[PDB]
Amino acid sequence: MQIFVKTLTGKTITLEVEPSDTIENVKAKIQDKEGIPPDQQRLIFAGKQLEDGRTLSDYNIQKESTLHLVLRLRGG
């Protein structure tokens, strides 16, 4: 199943998921693709932050939804 993540600076990242992947699964995939720790990452869609224990289903993600990966400096 296709999702995309776009950055805060620029560029897009290409992702194969499953509807049942947890939001931690996206960030660990992404942590392979470009070495960004899940502790740096916030994800946003539709004016909400995506908390790490929920699925692509819970947050109503349809196929090919481009997503906005945002960043900490360090914390919170």
The full length of the chain comes to 76
Q: Return the CATH number at 41.
A: 3.10.20.90
The coordinates were experimentally obtained by NMR
Q: State the total domains in the chain.
A: 1
Question: For residue 12, what are the CA distances in angstroms to 6, 20, 33, 69, 75?
Answer: 4, 22, 12, 10, 24
The DSSP letter of residue 41 is: E
Which of 75, 73, 76, 58 lies closest to 19 in space, CA to CA? 58
Tell me the chain's radius of gyration from C-alpha atoms: 11
Q: Determine the distance from the C-alpha atom of residue 15 to the mean position of all C-alpha atoms in its chain, rounded to a whole number.
A: 10
Apex 17 CA angle, 41 and 68, nearest 5: 35
The parent domain of residue 35 ranges over: 1-76
E strands along the chain, which residues? 2-6, 12-16, 41-45, 48-49, 66-71
